[PDB]
Design a protein around this nucleic acid. Sequence first.
DNA 1: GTGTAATCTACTGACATCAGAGTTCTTAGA
Lengths: 12, 784, 868
Amino acid sequence: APSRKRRQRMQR
Amino acid sequence: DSFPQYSPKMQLVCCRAIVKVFLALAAKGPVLRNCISTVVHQGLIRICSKPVVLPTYKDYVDLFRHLLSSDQMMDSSESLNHLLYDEFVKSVLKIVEKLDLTLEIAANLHPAKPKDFSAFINLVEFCREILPEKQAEFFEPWVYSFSYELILQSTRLPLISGFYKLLSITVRNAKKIKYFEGVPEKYSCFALFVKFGKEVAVKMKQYKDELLASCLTFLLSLPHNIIELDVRAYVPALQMAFKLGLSYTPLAEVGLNALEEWSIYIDRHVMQPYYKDILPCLDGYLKTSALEVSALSRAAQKGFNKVVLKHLKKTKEAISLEEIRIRVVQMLGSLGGQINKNLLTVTSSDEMMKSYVAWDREKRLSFAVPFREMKPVIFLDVFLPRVTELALTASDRQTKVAACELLHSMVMFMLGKATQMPEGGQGAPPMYQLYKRTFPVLLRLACDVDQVTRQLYEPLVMQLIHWFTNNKKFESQDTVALLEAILDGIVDPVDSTLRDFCGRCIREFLKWSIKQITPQQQEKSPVNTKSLFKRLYSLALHPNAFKRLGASLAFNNIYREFREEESLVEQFVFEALVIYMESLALAHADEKSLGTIQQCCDAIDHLCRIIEKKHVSLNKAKKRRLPRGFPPSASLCLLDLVKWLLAHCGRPQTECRHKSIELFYKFVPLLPGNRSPNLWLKDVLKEEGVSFLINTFEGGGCGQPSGILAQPTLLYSLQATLCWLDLLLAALECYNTFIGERTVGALQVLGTEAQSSLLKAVAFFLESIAMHDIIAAEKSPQEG
Amino acid sequence: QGLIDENPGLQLIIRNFWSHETRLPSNTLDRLLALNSLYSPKIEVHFLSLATNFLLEMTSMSPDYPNPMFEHPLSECEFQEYTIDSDWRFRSTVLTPMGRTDLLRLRRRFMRDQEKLSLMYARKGVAEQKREKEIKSELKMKQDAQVVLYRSYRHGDLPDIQIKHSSLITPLQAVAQRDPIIAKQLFSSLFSGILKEMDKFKTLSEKNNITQKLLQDFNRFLNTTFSFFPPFVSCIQDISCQHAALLSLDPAAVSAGCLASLQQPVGIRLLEEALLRLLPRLPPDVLRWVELAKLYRSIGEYDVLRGIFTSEIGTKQITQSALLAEARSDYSEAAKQYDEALNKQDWVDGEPTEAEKDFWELASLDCYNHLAEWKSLEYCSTASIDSENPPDLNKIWSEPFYQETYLPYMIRSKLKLLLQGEADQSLLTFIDKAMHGELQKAILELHYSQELSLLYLLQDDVDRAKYYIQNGIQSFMQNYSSIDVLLHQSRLTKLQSVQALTEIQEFISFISKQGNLSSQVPLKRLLNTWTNRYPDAKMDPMNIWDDIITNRCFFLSKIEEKLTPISSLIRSCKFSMKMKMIDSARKQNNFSLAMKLLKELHKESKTRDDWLVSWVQSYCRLSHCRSRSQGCSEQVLTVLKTVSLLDENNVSSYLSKNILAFRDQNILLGTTYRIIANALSSEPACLAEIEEDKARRILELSGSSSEDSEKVIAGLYQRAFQHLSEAVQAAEEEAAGVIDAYMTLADFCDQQLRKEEENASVIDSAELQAYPALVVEKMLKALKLNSNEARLKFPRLLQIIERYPEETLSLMTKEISSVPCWQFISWISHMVALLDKDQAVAVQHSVEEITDNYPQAIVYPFIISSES
DNA sequence: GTGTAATCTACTGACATCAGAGTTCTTAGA
């Protein structure tokens, strides 16, 4: 299975 | 003689002059060749006799290096540089044979004369700088002859360090020229080094200080082809080399070269069991991480002119401890991960699991820090587990001494806090659990190498040893912990200098156990005075070699008590002579290279001489200390215990039967009445008859397991038959002494009545064994 | 920063500057509080020794500093002064037997030969030039060896107990100044002593302010450290574990610090103490609970991660499923489970936390790294940082999360792709940019000096490779020496790097040498040593294994090019080296990494008999260990279908050129048949009836010819037994030999016995007229050797040789009396008690020998087995 | 030897200048 991701925003 | 006096380019021109005259003689044929040999011999005598202190041997080695090296001078030579090397190395054997090196008046002696002995030490440190690894076939004719003739000198004179130095150069030079490869004089020099290697690997288990370092440097330098012959003999040399090396860097440098060579070439399945206690010694080299304006600098500051090149061109000894640290990480990785796990104490085990508990159940050493506002409390017993490791094992010297003086001030704190009586017994005495853990550290760290550490803790342990004999404290388990720490100290299986110190510690503990304590309790109240003797006896009778060794090393010190005081307890050593001489029943069988126990039987010389000064009371009545090896108690016991030495002659144990015999032949005129060996033997031979003498000159040892039976050994093979070949050897060496001392009528001795050993066994040995044994059986290295 | 300055004179002036009672306060609390301001990370390696040097030197002025610790001597005794040599020496270095009144000074005269005067200065100049060289050489020796003593000593017949407070505190500081792990013990003990004391003086209203202030600082220390120096990172966390309020410390900061500083156990006890003390109300406190899991998973304690993730808290059971798969080492299944957790776009019971989403991100990054999925790991480690199509790697420095979590895997995966030939300039330009900034430089050359030394060596900068690798050795020693001795797992996981650094360093040596590179001769010698220098195949994890082997591979390809003008040498090493990574992956139970390696080498192995037989043997080994756990039915597919075809080879009957391979193949195809038959013994009625299609004819050719539904297992076992027996004949034509072969018969035979005793199979009983006779002789032939499995199994014999009586004859009549008698002491109480049964004829000869050799061993239990 | 003077000899920008080479015109000219 292909490995996919997306960006994330760190809320701090 | 004048070479040292010149400027640097003119010291080259001098070599050019002295080099050209040697060529000019050799062209005249052989009438001047022997004159060449005399000049280099003569010049060498004048430099090695040039004075030295702790115009010098270092001022000349540049000349001799140029002379013995410079191949370019013929074209701008090889047959000269060859010949002249042979003349130089010849002169070393001539000069050593001119030296006497006599040693008569290990510190208890002085050499013959300083104007002789210093010429050897200079020749040593000189020839060390100039002989090594010239290769080029220049050393190949010499290896066997030079080693053999210099080995003889070392076997004549142990305790002369320089022969191990010249022999270490010899064997390293040999290793690099591939000389021992494939196992002629070559398989003679092989067997020569094999038995010399086994032999000194015993001898160094008694050596110390800079003598020890020199013969260690020899041992670790032997070639892999020899070392694989019972590796366990050599392992405790490399462990000891790493132990020394972290306070004497060139020994660590040797140790890493040895481990490197063994690692790469010895068979993997042979080597595997030993990494388990080679590797843990390396931790010290990585245990602590140790946490300019020169003329060229100022010159280059002003500009990059020609002057800078002069300084840099002119700019263009031991390995640094910074180099050893990177070398040990690199070398440790070089064993691969399968092996290098063994750096950590063990593979996963109870052994490290046992270490997670603190050294005490509850905090002793509560210490109030001197502040001005307040008095916060530190419990110092958290620092010991790390400070003890630093004080031994820190390779950075400045860390080490500061960790010592913390531990010194912290054990002063210890004694004081205990002596305020924080609790007075009713269980484990306070800090007994610390004392049990810090006393063994205090021993290991008195006879540390580092001289600044030794000058601090040798006096402190003797100081503690005084305090721990006293009117109250002699009964305390503080002293039981102390005694059993020191009497584990003498046993140590991997240190030669710890055992000596712990012996000298037992010496002092015994002295103050007489001198300081009131003897009214001392007869039976303590756990010290006799408790030393009864403890020692177990250690002697033990089958472990180092326990046997330890028990002897204790007596090798305490002889001076019977030269002093113990007029009743004289008897306890009368017990001990049998107990100790029977420990030599255990000596013969095995362990030879580790077991120096047979030489430690020379301790029994004192147990002879105490008789030779006191014999008149050794036939006084009614002194009846129970001995070992004698069922019935007795009052004139002290006579027939000489008949016991006669009974204890013809046993198979080859050293014990020797010791028994000279001791018996002395003890005999040391009986009253008839006082010559022949004249006292006159009665036993006249009345007991030669059949009794047969039962006591063949039958001897642990009663009589049938020692007169000659034919079954002929007929009945098993390797254990060698213990009977030794029984025959004893069954010769008996007759070897009686008629030669003129103590018996010879035709009585060689009897008609069942003397079957000389009648059948000697004949068969000669007719059928002594030349008959290519491979054979009576019906590997073991046979060989 | 002037407080670490290189010159001890300037190091002292700045210390003396801060020590002044106006720069830095005099009362102990405000001093202790103020010292937290004397930090920035460029000081961190020294800090603990400075803070303690500022607290104890406040005592240099105290009224007790010159008082004695104890008032009276141990008894009546007398004392003296003393001196210690302390100059030039270690013991093992010397051999055994060895002006108005003075104006006469203006009386002088001067040369007039400028020539002679120049000769004077030339003669002085040469002596000076030697004097310069020798005094520099002596100053080299004495620089390493110089010391100083911090206390004075007395001497006497007794210990000098009445020492001044000064004489302990001065050396206590002098060691803490100098070894970091004593500086950890001392600051911790002394700090915790100060905070115990304030309860003597100050109210709850002060202690609120103080504990909030210390906590506020320690958050800063954990959030701003860059070097994570292990004694410092642990100290703050020992301290904050002792006291309430301090115990609230930022958990993601704590966990990052402990994970990077390789020092997990101390970080765990803090979060543990928080998770009880802060909750004796939202239950899960997920940020503490999930960061505590992340710490335990790093120390590899998978079997306790069950107890965290029970669905009562942290209620996303996908985490429990994912953890279960990696606890079984299905890193491929675990990578799928975390992937769908991040892809699942809406949730009944509401969304997972940022804490869990980040946990799945980190745990899945790690799965692809236990796998070898470099392109997926490189994609993943770069995908989350930036919104471009080609993501801007330069963003990684944007917040401490990416620099902690993503950066380590990102640089690893870029670097892995370069070495196996993918020509991207992305990493080299990223590092070139990073090396412009002083903090980014200090991160890289401290933590990544392996990867960096490979990167510049891919460029042929052997000079920058010499630099970064040497700095890799120095930064290893610092961290290793600083890890405290009780942390066996931490110290053990440092040692794993030491082989890798040494493969680089040996090659940088080799490539520099003109005599080594010219011709083949020392290249064979290098190739030899690497062929038998592995990590620990039972213990060291696979991410250090493929580090060694993808590096070895690169070096061999680089030497191959450098020495172009030895494929027959190089292929033999490269293939046998890669084969060892397969069997160690198998023994580590990591199957999908092993599959991925196996399929690559097949097309190489096909070319040659030794490579092909080894490939068949290593593939079939791996199928057994795979199938062993694979449930009811997938066993017969995973071990019949292809594996049974694979060992019959026409080419593997190459006149049995060496017998060891025949012995090995003679194990493999028969343990293959046992599994296939034992599957059908677990259930007969369903495996054939459900697996109905492709296998059935080759299953018939793999078993008995008959269509009788029961007889197939007996047919399978008959051809198994003869093959097992054939292995013995190869084994007796050479401790890796006969004992392993003999014990596999013994096992299969006696397993057929356990199953047999539960039913009645006459025709199995007929071949069993051989079975237990072939058990007893061959099984016991092991017991002259190490053989502990068989010594553990000996309690069976005496009851089988009762319930099948006749075959007892085959035990006593020949070589039970050959067994070394010391083997049979193990449970002698049982055999020596049985003396009334006829089978005691077996006991006789061995307990006669034990009565002869070792009466002490038999006597005590014997007196009561003799009774009654 | 080592270090600090003092001072010769270089190189460059710039200016004049001989020579040497490119270019148009008279006479003697098939």
